[PDB]
Amino acid sequence: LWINKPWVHSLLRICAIISVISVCMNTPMTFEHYPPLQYVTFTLDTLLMFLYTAEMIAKMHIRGIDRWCVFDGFMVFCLWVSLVLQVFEIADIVDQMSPWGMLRIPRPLIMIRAFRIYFRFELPRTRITNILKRSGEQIWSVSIFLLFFLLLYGILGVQMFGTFTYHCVVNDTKPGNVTWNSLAIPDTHCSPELEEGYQCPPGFKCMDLEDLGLSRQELGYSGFNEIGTSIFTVYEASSQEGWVFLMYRAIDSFPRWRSYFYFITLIFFLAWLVKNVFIAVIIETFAEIRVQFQQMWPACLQKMMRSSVFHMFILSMVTVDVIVAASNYYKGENFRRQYDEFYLAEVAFTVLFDLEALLKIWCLGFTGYISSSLHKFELLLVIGTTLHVYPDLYHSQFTYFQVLRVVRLIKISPALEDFVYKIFGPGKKLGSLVVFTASLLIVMSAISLQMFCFVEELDRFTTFPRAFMSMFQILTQEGWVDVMDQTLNAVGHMWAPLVAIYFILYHLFATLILLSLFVAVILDNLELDEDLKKLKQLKQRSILSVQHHIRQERREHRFRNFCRVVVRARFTKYHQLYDLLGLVTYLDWVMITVTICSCISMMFESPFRRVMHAPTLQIAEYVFVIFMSIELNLKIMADGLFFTPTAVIRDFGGVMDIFIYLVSLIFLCWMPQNVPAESGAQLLMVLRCLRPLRIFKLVPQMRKVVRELFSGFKEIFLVSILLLTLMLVFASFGVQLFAGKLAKCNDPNIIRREDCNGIFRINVSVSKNLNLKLRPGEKKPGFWVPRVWANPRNFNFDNVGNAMLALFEVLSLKGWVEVRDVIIHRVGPIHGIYIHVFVFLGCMIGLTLFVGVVIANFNENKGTALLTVDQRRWEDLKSRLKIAQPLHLPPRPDNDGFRAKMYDITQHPFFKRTIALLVLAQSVLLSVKWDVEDPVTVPLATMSVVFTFIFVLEVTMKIIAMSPAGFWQSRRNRYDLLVTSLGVVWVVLHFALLNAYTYMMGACVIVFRFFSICGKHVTLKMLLLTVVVSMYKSFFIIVGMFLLLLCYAFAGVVLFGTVKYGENINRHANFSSAGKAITVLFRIVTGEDWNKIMHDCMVQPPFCTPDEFTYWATDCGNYAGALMYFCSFYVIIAYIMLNLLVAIIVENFSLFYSTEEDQLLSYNDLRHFQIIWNMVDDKREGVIPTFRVKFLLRLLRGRLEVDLDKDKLLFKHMCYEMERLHNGGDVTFHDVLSMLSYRSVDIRKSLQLEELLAREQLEYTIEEEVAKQTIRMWLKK
Amino acid sequence: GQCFTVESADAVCNLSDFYLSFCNSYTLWELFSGLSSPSTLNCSLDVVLTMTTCRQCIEAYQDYDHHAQEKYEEFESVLHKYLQSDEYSVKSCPEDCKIVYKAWLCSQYFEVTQFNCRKTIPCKQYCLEVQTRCPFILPDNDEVIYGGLSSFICTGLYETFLTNDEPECCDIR
Ligand SMILES: CC(C)CCC[C@@H](C)[C@H]1CC[C@H]2[C@@H]3CC=C4C[C@@H](O)CC[C@]4(C)[C@H]3CC[C@]12C
Ligand SMILES: CC(C)CCC[C@@H](C)[C@H]1CC[C@H]2[C@@H]3CC=C4C[C@@H](O)CC[C@]4(C)[C@H]3CC[C@]12C
Ligand SMILES: *[C@@H]1O[C@H](CO)[C@@H](O)[C@H](O)[C@H]1NC(C)=O
Ligand SMILES: *[C@@H]1O[C@H](CO)[C@@H](O)[C@H](O)[C@H]1NC(C)=O
Ligand SMILES: *[C@@H]1O[C@H](CO)[C@@H](O)[C@H](O)[C@H]1NC(C)=O
């Protein structure tokens, strides 16, 4: 009675939160900064140690000494241990910088007690555990798949690259003596061979930096030294982290094609597809939750207040207020910003809205006011802004209230409000996920804090704010490897593997589960409710026996003819080629050819090879303009210009065609010899760069892609408005609190703006990663520069435009950590909250809304948006059975002892598991680079010879034991034969030639066998099919993304071809040719600092030399051009069009990956039916007669069992179904399989209304005729 | 009327004909009209006409010149180790950068007005020239996060870099 009260449990929960807070303050640095806190936290500990001890003895005295009680007792134990340890620490006995504080590691777990009440759901615990087991098995499978790809690319990186140890240094660098002052600026890699990589210029030599005394500890952790380093590097790259500069090193050290192929395929497979498979898994988890939840069951002042004119006036006042507050831009170091006219405007608006709230209260009473749940937010704003206007909380955290008033503006658009209610759903799915995310972040920060607060020279976990910033940064992925690297260096060499496992596991969970849950929650909010889907449709033992029982208990004239002929001309064993050749009219085929040739020509245009001065580049231009003039004239004469239903201008595509034609015609007629920067001629060249967009109109698959993408533009635009509103809120706040406060002296030893003059010796960046800390008595490279009081040049909050640009750059999470650090170091640490909140609201939620709306519109275009999850699973099963074929296993021979025993040997699961282990082991043989001057490569190649001889005997066994004819039946067997023949070829060459290309061929054969490993595992094969079939299904989407990228690449060669080298524009990334521009634009969406590149391309005087005549002589950048170009490209590609790849991966995952459900025909059932059909169909026809059907049905065992003890009626129904289907003959393995699938599900759930009525009519007819024949057998006797 | 590089304070002690060794665009006539090292600060050109004080000021000029030379050697050492020196700009080469940087540094050490210049330019403008012709050199980012700042910049937050009372020295470009 003393512990079951209502208030006591709330007390225990609040005290669990308080204990979390207590342990989050218990670090040595926190006690150095605030000594009182020490005793404070002790007291709290003691107090809680009392109370919880009570709730243990006051409870385990009732019951004799729920599986929460053991947890609560371990918590009490942790509290007691922390108490006695802190008593020892108070008495100065323990150092407090010793690892004893690690005993407080479990204490944060007490936070679970504060939320344990919210662990009661509407589903029984059995259904919850079934959901969790299904999701766990799927996550295990996808993790195995991920590990397969990681090992594949790790071996490829070991063999295609090596160590990046050759650097350009000054030639007078003696061995053993290299210093910071011998390297180049910036540090650059090179190749010692005259044909690969970067060649050092005169004055520099390419040295090894390993014969020179440098250690692989002061040279990084990345690279491809051995298989472990390489796997870690591949995993880092799959997060789009640090792979671009690794690629730059590879390009400088090795041939270029290697790096391009390697890293582009790594980003495409690992960073896009394999990553999207995890999102598919979480979306399937939510689909399974749905399936489980479904199968479980004044007299006049009031009138003027009610008028819409008053609402319009108040919303206009909110608009004016927030616009005026946002427009308080920085005006210089000689103004006040404290009691100025903006403050008086703020006072006036605060008084106005306080009067509005008072009036609403005085009209509707108080309780009727406050019940509105929107008047609650308005009263919160009234109070917060009134406190804000008090002239000591002006321009403080209280400003958050003022800038929040823009939320009221959501009531101008009913559609935006409905979209908000739709996409954010209930405050119990998304809100619960946000609370779980905050709690997980707090607990992991507290745990990492207790792990690392004592470690010397590690300022990432000294206090809870720092530990939380570190864990949040790992969540956002921006520089997470840097956090882990600093920690790994700090902890030492013995514990580094354990903390590396910790950080990798945390990153894996965070980025592959938490963010995927955000996506899945948004998608579930956008997906119609199951009951609503069924209601909207209405407005318009063995599983066979279970379904049978359910089914039972339920019972003028001329020259237009010639033009029309020419523009409509078009155009079976091989009908695929004939459909490819008749895809478009001959006129469109010619025009596609001419478009492609013109784009290929434009790929040679550069600032120094111009189309206006080079005739070979004008060939394609003249051809394009002439042929498009002919095409337009023909189509306009034939199909009319505007009026005709198939006129030329009837959609946006024809308008764009006319636009492109006119641009190219004006350019070719003009052909200006001088093109000034930012002129109309350069704008004309940029518009001419839009020529690839004609492929989007001439190819119907591209038209389909564009049409389906723009079918969801309303939702895309509403998400854009929500993100703009968020950025406006935070940009107004940033202008009010940060304007003029981000500047400081570029000399770190200066503090006051009055001391910031003269010159100082600045240190220049040599190597960001390399750690040649060795400096005997010399200083770091640098030189003398003026002291300047400057903004960071990449972002400021001085006006609302700069603030919105900075927040848009932070939204991409690229370089956001530098913004965070600048705001915390130059304004104050309290203003870290600001940036973090934005990063949580804009990236984890904001961009996830784009992901969700794009996937939802995709699913709506393919038609599956109004189907229930059971109906969608039925469609996926019906597609899975439409491609299943009879099994490829010929029978075992009779009394052929040389083949029967060999049959039992090759078909025994021990043999297959042994072959898979051998594939993995030969794969492991490629762990060190197979060189030709390395000794270990000879043992490795000899063992590879042993392996390929083993696989030779395996293949000969499977060919003689099975058949030479039947061995060729399996495609996997054919691949294995191909790889084994390549293997024996390599063996005879390797012992004959023994060259370096011999080792290359051996490594290649090993890689192809490793790739064979994917056919020896069910889940691996299903996931590989998912990936490759979704890559096939995304061909035209990838073509469209490439077409957009090509347009942008041409435009960027025109705009940024000669931009002065800057922070990120350099010899590795620039727009000096179309190929360089293409590679740069690819890297800009897959893990490079695109905003740094944007700010390099915005360079203006006095940082460049303008030219008044031509752009190729001007060295400068386009400011507005760079803004529009980079922002629009990043939005279009990274936020919109890659989510199409996500949508396709999700579709194909639900199609190909099958789990053994209870109420559906599964993969094992398909295999069992295949075995039974193999035994019934003798000569392997794939088609049996009618009586073999009853034989097969009697034969089926397991889950397809039809036992003649309780389900004889079912047997007769199925046999008569197979009789009736073709008037009595020759069913075809899909008739019987379709019959099984139908008789194996509850058709009321799985089928749609048309198919349901058809099937129920069919089954009623069958049952009636079976009853008729039974009655006739009776009347016969 | 040709130049006369200064070598000894005593030997040279028509001042518009004696140029400094490294900062070879400043005559002694111009230095005595404005420059004065504070320790020996008595040289307002009234120490040459009316000579130990002169030796003290000319040796101060030579020390200024020598320190400017050391700093310039550090700069050209950085510029030598810059490998993209031939690619960074279609308009500027390392020699242009070197010349304008030497002019800027020499103006930092001798903040005086130059006379008898064919073409004249505000001396502060040489700062801007270093921003224009020299390559972007990323500064090291351990103590302070520079953002996207370059190593050499001239004008701060909300400042008109060119103002009144400028030395307005020669133009050598
Ligand atoms: C609930 C509490 C916090 C509300 C506080 C409101 C008070 C403190 C605010 C509201 C109006 C404000 C005043 C408005 C007018 C002026 C005159 C001006 O020349 C200086 C500021 C000054 C003197 C303000 C002082 C602070 C002020 C009096
Ligand atoms: C079959 C027809 C329609 C296609 C060929 C069109 C002919 C007329 C086109 C194609 C290539 C064109 C040439 C391409 C290059 C040049 C160099 C330029 O400085 C003058 C025009 C000139 C000489 C063009 C003249 C017209 C031209 C010869
Ligand atoms: C290293 O280089 C410095 C600089 O020239 C030189 O003084 C020193 O003797 C060298 N030491 C060795 C071991 O080469
Ligand atoms: C280094 O290279 C420079 C320029 O080629 C040359 O003058 C110098 O003598 C070289 N020093 C060596 C080779 O030690
Ligand atoms: C440059 O690095 C040195 C270390 O050699 C350090 O002492 C100095 O403070 C740094 N200078 C600047 C301006 O960062």
Residue numbers in the entry:
A (entry chain A): 31 to 95, 105 to 336, 374 to 616, 751 to 765, 843 to 858, 873 to 1578
B (entry chain B): 188 to 200, 226 to 262, 267 to 389
Paper text:
Here, we describe the structure of rat NALCN and mouse FAM155A in detergent to the resolution of 2.7 Å, which provides enhanced details and additional structural insights into the mechanism of this important channel complex. We prepared the NALCN–FAM155A complex in a buffer with sodium chloride and GDN detergent, mimicking the symmetric sodium solution used in electrophysiology recording. The map quality was sufficient for modeling the stable portions of NALCN and FAM155A which encompass 73% of NALCN and 37% of FAM155A. Interestingly, the arrangements of VS are highly asymmetric, with the voltage sensor of domain I (DI-VS) being the most off-axis. On the extracellular side, the CRD of FAM155A protrudes from the top of the complex into the extracellular space while the two predicted transmembrane helices of FAM155A were invisible, probably due to their flexibility. The CRD of FAM155A binds at the top of the NALCN channel. Extracellular loops of domain I, III, and IV (L5I, L5III, L5IV, and L6IV) in NALCN form a platform for FAM155A binding. Unexpectedly, we found the 1387–1390 region of domain IV has two possible alternative conformations, both of which were modeled in the allowed region in the Ramachandran plot validated by Phenix29. Therefore, the arrangement of charged residues at the HFS layer of NALCN selectivity filter (EEK_, − − + 0) is similar to NaV (DEKA, − − + 0) but different from CaV (EEEE, − − − − ), providing a plausible explanation of the sodium selectivity of NALCN. The gate is tightly sealed by several hydrophobic residues on S6 helices, indicating the current structure represents a non-conductive state.
NALCN channel is a voltage-modulated sodium-selective ion channel. It mediates sodium leak currents that are essential for setting the membrane excitability. Sequence analysis shows NALCN protein shares a similar domain arrangement to the pore subunit of eukaryotic voltage-gated sodium channels NaV or calcium channels CaV. In addition to the NALCN subunit, FAM155, UNC79, and UNC80 subunits are indispensable for the function of NALCN channel.
